Coordinates of C-alpha atoms and ligand atoms in Angstrom, one line a residue:
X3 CA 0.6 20.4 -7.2
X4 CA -0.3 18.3 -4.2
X5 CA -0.2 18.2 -0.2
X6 CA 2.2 15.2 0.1
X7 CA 5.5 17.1 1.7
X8 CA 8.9 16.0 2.4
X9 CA 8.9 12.9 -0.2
X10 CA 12.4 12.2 -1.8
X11 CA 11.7 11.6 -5.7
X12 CA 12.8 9.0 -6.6
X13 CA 11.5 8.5 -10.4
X14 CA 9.4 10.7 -12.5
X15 CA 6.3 9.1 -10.6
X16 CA 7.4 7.7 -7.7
X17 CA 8.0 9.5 -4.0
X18 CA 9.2 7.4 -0.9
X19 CA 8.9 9.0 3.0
X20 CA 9.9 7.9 6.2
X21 CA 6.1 7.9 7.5
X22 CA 3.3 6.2 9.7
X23 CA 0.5 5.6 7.0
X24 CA -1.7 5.6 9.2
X25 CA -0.6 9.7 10.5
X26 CA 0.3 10.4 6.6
X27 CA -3.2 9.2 5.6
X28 CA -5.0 11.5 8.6
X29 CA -3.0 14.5 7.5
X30 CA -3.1 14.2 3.6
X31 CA -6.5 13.3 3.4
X32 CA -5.1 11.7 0.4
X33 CA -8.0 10.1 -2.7
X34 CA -6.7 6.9 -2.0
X35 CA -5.1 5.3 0.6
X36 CA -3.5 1.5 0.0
X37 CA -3.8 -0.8 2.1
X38 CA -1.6 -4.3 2.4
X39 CA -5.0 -6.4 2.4
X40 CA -5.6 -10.2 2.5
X41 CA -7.6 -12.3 0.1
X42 CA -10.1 -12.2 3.2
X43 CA -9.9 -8.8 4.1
X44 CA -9.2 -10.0 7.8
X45 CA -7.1 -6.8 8.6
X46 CA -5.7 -8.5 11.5
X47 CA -1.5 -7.0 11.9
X48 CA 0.7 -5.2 9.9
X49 CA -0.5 -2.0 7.7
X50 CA -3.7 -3.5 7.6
X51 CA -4.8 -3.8 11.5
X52 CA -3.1 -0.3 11.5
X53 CA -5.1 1.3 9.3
X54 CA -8.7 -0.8 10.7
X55 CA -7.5 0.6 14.0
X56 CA -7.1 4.1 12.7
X57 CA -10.8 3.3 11.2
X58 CA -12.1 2.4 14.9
X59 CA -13.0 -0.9 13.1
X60 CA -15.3 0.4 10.4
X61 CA -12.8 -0.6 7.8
X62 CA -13.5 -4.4 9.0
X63 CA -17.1 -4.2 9.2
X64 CA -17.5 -2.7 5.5
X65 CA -15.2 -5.5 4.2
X66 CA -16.6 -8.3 6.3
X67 CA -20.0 -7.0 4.3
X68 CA -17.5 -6.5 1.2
X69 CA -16.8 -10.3 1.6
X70 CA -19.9 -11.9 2.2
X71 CA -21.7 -10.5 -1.0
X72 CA -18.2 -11.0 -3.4
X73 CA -16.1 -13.8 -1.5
X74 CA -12.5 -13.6 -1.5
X75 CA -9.8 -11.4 -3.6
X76 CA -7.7 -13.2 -5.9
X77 CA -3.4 -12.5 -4.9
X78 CA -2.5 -9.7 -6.7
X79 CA -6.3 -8.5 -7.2
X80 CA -7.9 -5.6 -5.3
X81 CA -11.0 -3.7 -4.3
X82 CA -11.9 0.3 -3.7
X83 CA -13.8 0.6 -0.4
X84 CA -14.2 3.5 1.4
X85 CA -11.2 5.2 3.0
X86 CA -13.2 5.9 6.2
X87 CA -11.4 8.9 8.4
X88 CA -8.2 8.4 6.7
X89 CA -8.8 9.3 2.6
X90 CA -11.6 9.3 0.1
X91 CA -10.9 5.5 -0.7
X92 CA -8.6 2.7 0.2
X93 CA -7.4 0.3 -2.3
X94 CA -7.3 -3.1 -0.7
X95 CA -4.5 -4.7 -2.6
X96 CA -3.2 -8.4 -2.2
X97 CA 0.4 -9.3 -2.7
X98 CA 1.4 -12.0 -2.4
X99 CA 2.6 -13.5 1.2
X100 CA 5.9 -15.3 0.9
X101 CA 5.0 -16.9 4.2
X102 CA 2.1 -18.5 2.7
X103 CA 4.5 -19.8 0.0
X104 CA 2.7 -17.2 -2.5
X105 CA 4.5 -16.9 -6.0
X106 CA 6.4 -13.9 -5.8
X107 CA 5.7 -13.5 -9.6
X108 CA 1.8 -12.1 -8.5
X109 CA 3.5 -8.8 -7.2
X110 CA 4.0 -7.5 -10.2
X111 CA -0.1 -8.0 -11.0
X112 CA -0.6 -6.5 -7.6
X113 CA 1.3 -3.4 -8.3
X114 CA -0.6 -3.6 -11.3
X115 CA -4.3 -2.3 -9.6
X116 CA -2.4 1.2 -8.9
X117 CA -2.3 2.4 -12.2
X118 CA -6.5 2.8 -12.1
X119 CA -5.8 5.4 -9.5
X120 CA -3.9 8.9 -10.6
X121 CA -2.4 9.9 -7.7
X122 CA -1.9 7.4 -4.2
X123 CA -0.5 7.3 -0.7
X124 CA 0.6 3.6 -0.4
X125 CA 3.3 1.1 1.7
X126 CA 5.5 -1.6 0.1
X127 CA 3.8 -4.4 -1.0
X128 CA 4.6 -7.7 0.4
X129 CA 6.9 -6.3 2.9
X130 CA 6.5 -6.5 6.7
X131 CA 4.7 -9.5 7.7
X132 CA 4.1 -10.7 3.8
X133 CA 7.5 -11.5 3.8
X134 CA 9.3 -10.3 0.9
X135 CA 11.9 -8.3 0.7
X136 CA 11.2 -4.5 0.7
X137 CA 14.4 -3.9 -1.9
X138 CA 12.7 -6.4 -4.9
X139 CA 9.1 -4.4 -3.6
X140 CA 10.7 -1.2 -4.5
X141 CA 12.2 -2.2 -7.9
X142 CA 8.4 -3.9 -8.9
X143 CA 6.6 -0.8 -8.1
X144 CA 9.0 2.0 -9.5
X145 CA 9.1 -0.6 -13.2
X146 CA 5.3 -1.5 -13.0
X147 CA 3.0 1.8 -11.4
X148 CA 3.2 4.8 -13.8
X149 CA 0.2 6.9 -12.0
X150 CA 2.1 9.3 -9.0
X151 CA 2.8 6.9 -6.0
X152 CA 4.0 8.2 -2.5
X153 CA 5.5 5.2 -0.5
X154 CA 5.2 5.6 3.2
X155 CA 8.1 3.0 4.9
X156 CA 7.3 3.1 8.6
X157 CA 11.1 1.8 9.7
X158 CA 13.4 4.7 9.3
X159 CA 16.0 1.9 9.1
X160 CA 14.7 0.3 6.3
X161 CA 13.8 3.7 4.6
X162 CA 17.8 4.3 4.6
X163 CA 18.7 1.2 3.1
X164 CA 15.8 1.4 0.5
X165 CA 17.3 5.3 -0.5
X166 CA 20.9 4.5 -0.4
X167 CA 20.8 1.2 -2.6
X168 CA 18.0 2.7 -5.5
X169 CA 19.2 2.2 -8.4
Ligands
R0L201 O1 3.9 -4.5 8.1 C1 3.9 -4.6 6.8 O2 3.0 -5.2 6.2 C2 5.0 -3.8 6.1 C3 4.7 -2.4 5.9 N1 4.5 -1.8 7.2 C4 4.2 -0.4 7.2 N2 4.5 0.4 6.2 C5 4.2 1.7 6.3 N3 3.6 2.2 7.3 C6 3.2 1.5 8.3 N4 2.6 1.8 9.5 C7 2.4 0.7 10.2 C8 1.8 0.5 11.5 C9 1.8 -0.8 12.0 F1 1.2 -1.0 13.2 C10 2.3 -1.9 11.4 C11 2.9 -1.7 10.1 C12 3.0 -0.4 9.5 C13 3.5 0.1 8.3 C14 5.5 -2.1 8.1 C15 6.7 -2.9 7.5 O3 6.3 -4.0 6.7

Protein backbone atom coordinates (compact mmCIF):
# COMPACT_ATOMS: atom_id res chain seq x y z
CA UNK A 1 0.00 0.00 0.00
CA UNK A 2 0.86 3.60 -0.90
CA UNK A 3 -0.38 7.37 -0.70
CA UNK A 4 -0.86 7.89 -4.44
CA UNK A 5 -5.01 8.22 -4.62
CA UNK A 6 -7.28 8.52 -7.38
CA UNK A 7 -4.93 6.82 -10.14
CA UNK A 8 -6.91 4.73 -12.90
CA UNK A 9 -4.85 1.31 -13.28
CA UNK A 10 -4.10 0.91 -16.16
CA UNK A 11 -1.70 -2.30 -16.18
CA UNK A 12 -0.44 -4.44 -13.39
CA UNK A 13 2.25 -1.63 -12.78
CA UNK A 14 1.23 1.26 -14.27
CA UNK A 15 -1.36 4.17 -12.79
CA UNK A 16 -2.16 7.47 -14.88
CA UNK A 17 -3.94 10.85 -13.06
CA UNK A 18 -5.11 13.92 -14.27
CA UNK A 19 -2.50 15.93 -11.97
CA UNK A 20 -0.05 18.97 -11.59
CA UNK A 21 3.38 17.09 -10.80
CA UNK A 22 4.43 19.68 -9.31
CA UNK A 23 1.07 19.67 -6.43
CA UNK A 24 1.15 15.56 -6.75
CA UNK A 25 4.89 15.67 -5.82
CA UNK A 26 4.28 18.31 -2.69
CA UNK A 27 1.44 16.10 -1.46
CA UNK A 28 2.84 12.51 -1.99
CA UNK A 29 6.13 13.22 -0.90
CA UNK A 30 6.78 10.49 -3.23
CA UNK A 31 10.77 8.55 -3.19
CA UNK A 32 11.16 9.70 -6.50
CA UNK A 33 9.91 12.28 -8.53
CA UNK A 34 10.82 12.26 -12.59
CA UNK A 35 11.60 14.96 -14.09
CA UNK A 36 11.55 15.65 -18.18
CA UNK A 37 15.30 16.77 -17.99
CA UNK A 38 17.73 17.99 -20.77
CA UNK A 39 21.13 16.56 -21.56
CA UNK A 40 22.14 20.06 -19.77
CA UNK A 41 20.01 19.96 -17.04
CA UNK A 42 18.96 23.63 -18.08
CA UNK A 43 15.38 23.17 -16.50
CA UNK A 44 14.21 26.11 -18.44
CA UNK A 45 9.99 25.23 -19.54
CA UNK A 46 7.86 22.47 -19.53
CA UNK A 47 7.86 19.88 -16.36
CA UNK A 48 11.23 20.79 -15.87
CA UNK A 49 11.08 24.77 -15.11
CA UNK A 50 7.93 23.57 -13.14
CA UNK A 51 9.34 21.46 -10.95
CA UNK A 52 12.92 24.05 -10.57
CA UNK A 53 10.22 26.60 -9.76
CA UNK A 54 8.46 24.47 -7.22
CA UNK A 55 12.33 23.90 -5.92
CA UNK A 56 12.75 27.99 -5.60
CA UNK A 57 15.64 27.22 -7.98
CA UNK A 58 17.72 24.79 -5.85
CA UNK A 59 16.96 22.04 -8.32
CA UNK A 60 19.11 24.33 -10.92
CA UNK A 61 21.88 25.16 -8.75
CA UNK A 62 22.51 21.37 -7.69
CA UNK A 63 22.44 20.38 -11.32
CA UNK A 64 24.45 23.29 -12.60
CA UNK A 65 27.09 21.77 -9.88
CA UNK A 66 25.75 18.22 -11.16
CA UNK A 67 27.02 19.35 -14.67
CA UNK A 68 30.16 21.00 -14.14
CA UNK A 69 31.90 17.97 -12.30
CA UNK A 70 30.05 15.11 -14.84
CA UNK A 71 29.24 17.14 -18.23
CA UNK A 72 26.20 16.35 -20.04
CA UNK A 73 23.52 13.31 -19.95
CA UNK A 74 23.46 11.15 -22.82
CA UNK A 75 19.45 11.07 -24.58
CA UNK A 76 17.80 8.47 -22.99
CA UNK A 77 20.39 8.48 -19.86
CA UNK A 78 19.58 9.92 -16.40
CA UNK A 79 20.81 11.02 -13.05
CA UNK A 80 19.29 10.82 -9.20
CA UNK A 81 19.67 14.26 -7.53
CA UNK A 82 17.95 15.31 -4.74
CA UNK A 83 14.14 15.79 -4.91
CA UNK A 84 14.44 19.05 -2.89
CA UNK A 85 10.73 20.07 -1.25
CA UNK A 86 8.95 17.88 -3.60
CA UNK A 87 10.28 13.94 -2.88
CA UNK A 88 13.22 12.11 -1.61
CA UNK A 89 14.87 12.12 -5.17
CA UNK A 90 14.22 13.20 -8.65
CA UNK A 91 15.19 11.21 -11.57
CA UNK A 92 16.38 13.54 -14.26
CA UNK A 93 15.55 11.52 -17.37
CA UNK A 94 16.27 12.54 -21.08
CA UNK A 95 14.01 11.64 -23.87
CA UNK A 96 14.52 12.33 -26.66
CA UNK A 97 13.25 15.93 -28.16
CA UNK A 98 11.59 15.36 -31.56
CA UNK A 99 12.11 19.06 -32.06
CA UNK A 100 15.78 18.64 -31.86
CA UNK A 101 15.38 15.89 -34.58
CA UNK A 102 16.18 13.28 -31.70
CA UNK A 103 15.63 9.52 -32.77
CA UNK A 104 12.48 8.52 -31.32
CA UNK A 105 14.02 5.06 -30.92
CA UNK A 106 16.13 6.49 -27.54
CA UNK A 107 12.62 6.63 -25.65
CA UNK A 108 12.51 3.33 -25.09
CA UNK A 109 16.31 3.50 -23.30
CA UNK A 110 14.91 6.47 -21.48
CA UNK A 111 11.94 4.65 -20.07
CA UNK A 112 14.48 2.27 -19.46
CA UNK A 113 16.25 4.30 -16.13
CA UNK A 114 12.76 3.70 -14.28
CA UNK A 115 13.05 0.28 -13.62
CA UNK A 116 16.20 1.11 -10.87
CA UNK A 117 13.54 2.82 -8.93
CA UNK A 118 10.53 0.54 -7.21
CA UNK A 119 7.91 2.76 -6.96
CA UNK A 120 7.75 6.51 -9.00
CA UNK A 121 5.65 9.64 -9.53
CA UNK A 122 6.53 10.56 -13.15
CA UNK A 123 5.05 12.65 -16.54
CA UNK A 124 5.16 11.36 -20.17
CA UNK A 125 8.29 11.34 -21.61
CA UNK A 126 8.93 13.28 -24.57
CA UNK A 127 5.56 14.89 -24.55
CA UNK A 128 4.88 18.59 -24.09
CA UNK A 129 7.56 20.70 -25.46
CA UNK A 130 9.77 17.39 -26.48
CA UNK A 131 7.52 16.87 -29.05
CA UNK A 132 6.28 13.46 -29.39
CA UNK A 133 3.26 12.30 -29.16
CA UNK A 134 1.86 11.49 -25.70
CA UNK A 135 -0.19 8.19 -27.18
CA UNK A 136 3.33 6.37 -28.56
CA UNK A 137 4.86 7.77 -24.81
CA UNK A 138 2.18 5.79 -23.13
CA UNK A 139 2.47 2.54 -25.15
CA UNK A 140 6.69 2.83 -24.53
CA UNK A 141 6.31 3.18 -20.93
CA UNK A 142 3.43 0.62 -20.02
CA UNK A 143 5.78 -2.20 -22.61
CA UNK A 144 9.22 -1.10 -21.21
CA UNK A 145 8.86 0.05 -17.01
CA UNK A 146 7.88 -2.97 -14.88
CA UNK A 147 8.69 -1.15 -11.25
CA UNK A 148 5.04 0.74 -10.08
CA UNK A 149 4.79 4.02 -12.15
CA UNK A 150 2.08 6.80 -11.44
CA UNK A 151 1.82 9.07 -14.63
CA UNK A 152 0.75 12.61 -13.77
CA UNK A 153 -0.75 14.23 -17.38
CA UNK A 154 -1.33 17.92 -16.47
CA UNK A 155 -4.03 18.52 -19.66
CA UNK A 156 -7.26 16.96 -18.60
CA UNK A 157 -7.84 16.93 -22.37
CA UNK A 158 -5.09 14.89 -23.12
CA UNK A 159 -5.62 12.62 -20.00
CA UNK A 160 -9.09 11.66 -21.80
CA UNK A 161 -7.86 10.83 -24.98
CA UNK A 162 -4.76 8.90 -23.41
CA UNK A 163 -7.68 6.70 -21.17
CA UNK A 164 -10.15 6.28 -23.85
CA UNK A 165 -7.77 4.96 -26.66
CA UNK A 166 -5.42 2.45 -24.22
CA UNK A 167 -5.24 -0.46 -25.49
O1 LIG B 1 5.49 19.98 -20.93
C1 LIG B 1 5.87 18.79 -21.06
O2 LIG B 1 7.10 18.54 -21.13
C2 LIG B 1 4.85 17.65 -21.15
C3 LIG B 1 4.44 17.20 -19.75
N1 LIG B 1 3.92 18.32 -19.05
C4 LIG B 1 3.43 18.04 -17.72
N2 LIG B 1 3.03 16.83 -17.34
C5 LIG B 1 2.58 16.64 -16.10
N3 LIG B 1 2.52 17.63 -15.24
C6 LIG B 1 2.90 18.87 -15.55
N4 LIG B 1 2.92 20.00 -14.85
C7 LIG B 1 3.39 21.00 -15.60
C8 LIG B 1 3.59 22.35 -15.30
C9 LIG B 1 4.10 23.21 -16.26
F1 LIG B 1 4.30 24.52 -15.97
C10 LIG B 1 4.42 22.72 -17.53
C11 LIG B 1 4.21 21.38 -17.83
C12 LIG B 1 3.69 20.51 -16.85
C13 LIG B 1 3.38 19.12 -16.82
C14 LIG B 1 2.96 19.06 -19.80
C15 LIG B 1 2.61 18.46 -21.16
O3 LIG B 1 3.73 18.06 -21.93
Amino acid sequence: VNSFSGYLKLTDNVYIKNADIVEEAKKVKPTVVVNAANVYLKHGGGVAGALNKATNNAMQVESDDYIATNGPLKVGGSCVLSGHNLAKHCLHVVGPNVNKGEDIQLLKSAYENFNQHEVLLAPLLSAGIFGADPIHSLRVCVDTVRTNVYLAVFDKNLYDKLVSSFL
